[PDB]
């Protein structure tokens, strides 16, 4: 909470006068002094409170942490190595890592539980088609 949102009605009632009587700006100067006023109002709120090429990500595993596991079955001799076990004896080395990795992230769409239908009641109001000065 902040103090500014504590200001209340009945306090806007008569409360001094912002400018001293002796320092009135004159006509021509005010008439030439519109632009800074306008840009102040319009993007005061933008500067204060409002404030290529594909890239590859790194591969998940680092080589020094491969820690390949031994087989549960304890083979005694090289003679009895079977023809099904060649898959995966050799740990990858510096040569076999892919240099670049381009994954797909789905975290944005792993959300939005369901599409929305406005289960509401108009409230559109009319703006008129030509020179809104006659629309109610």
């Amino acid at each position: 909470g902040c103090k500014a949102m504590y200001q209340t009605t009945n306090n806007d009632y008569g409360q001094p006068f912002l400018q001293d009587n002796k320092t009135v700006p004159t006509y021509n100067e005010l008439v030439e002094a519109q632009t800074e006023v306008t840009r102040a109002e319009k993007q005061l709120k933008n500067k204060t409170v409002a404030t290529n090429v594909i890239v590859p990500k790194k591969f998940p595993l680092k080589e020094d942490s491969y820690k390949a596991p031994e087989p549960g079955l304890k083979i005694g001799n090289p003679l009895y190595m079977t023809a099904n076990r060649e898959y995966g004896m050799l740990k990858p080395t510096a040569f076999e890592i892919p240099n670049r990795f381009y994954p797909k992230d789905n975290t944005y769409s792993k959300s939005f539980p369901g599409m929305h239908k406005f289960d509401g009641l108009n409230t559109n109001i009319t703006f008129s088609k030509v020179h809104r000065a006659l629309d109610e």
């Binding site: 902040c2 500014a4 949102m5 200001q7 709120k45 204060t48 409170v49």
Partner: protein, 49 residues
Amino acid sequence: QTKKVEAELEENILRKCEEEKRYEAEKERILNEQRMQGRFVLQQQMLEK
């Protein structure tokens, strides 16, 4: 304009608080793995003894 921009300044702080709440939810998520790893290693060695 000063008071209105103070209001949006408050709204930004509200975002910051809710983001920290999301990070707290992630810290909560850590708990399951933190239990699981050691818990199941010991529970698997239990039958081995």
